[PDB]
Design a protein around this nucleic acid. Structure first.
Length: 115
RNA sequence: CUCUCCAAGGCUAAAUACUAGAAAGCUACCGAUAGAGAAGAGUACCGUGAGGGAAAGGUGAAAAGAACCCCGGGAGGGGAG
């Protein structure tokens, strides 16, 4: 389905997909200007990560299609998958130890020329 | 009774037990949770010490390891090879 000419992918980003998905829901299908404004405004780590990936996707589309400006572009699809995990130890009382997982996420954004 | 043997001195190869290993070979023996614990080692780690004891093999036929360009602080991705 993907026009892989027009897309950006960010692998192993430092946030959990459970925390990045809602921000993706708020910009899926919006216009590029509106999405960029939302991501700049909202002070969430996932918001900043999506901002980088979305800006890169728009840049790729513009570079390969010179007659496409920032205001014909809308964020067509947005996918947020889960990535590698790292386990570190958190020690507790009575010699008990717990493993403390750190999750990463993959982010895939495709833009498309507006309706 | 008869039949055998002649101690209280000292040696003796071979046939026999064994393979940590060395070389030459074999397997209706194993193929990475298997096989020695260990394809990387009694190392990492645990205990004052005696001692106990892991997990981790694979690009491609050849690095011929992605010139250069774009986004990004990078990472990474999108093109070009």
């Amino acid at each position: 389905l993907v026009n892989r000419r027009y897309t950006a992918k960010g692998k192993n980003l430092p946030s959990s997909p459970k925390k990045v998905r809602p921000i993706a829901d708020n910009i899926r299908g919006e216009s590029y200007i509106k999405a960029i404004a939302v991501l700049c405004s909202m002070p969430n780590k996932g918001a900043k990560l999506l901002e980088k990936v979305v800006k890169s996707a728009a840049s790729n589309a513009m570079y390969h299609n010179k007659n496409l400006s920032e205001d014909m572009i809308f964020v067509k699809t947005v996918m947020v998958d889960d990535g590698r995990r790292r386990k570190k130890i958190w020690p507790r009382a009575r010699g008990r130890a717990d493993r403390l997982v750190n999750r990463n996420c993959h982010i895939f954004v495709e833009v498309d020329e507006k309706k």
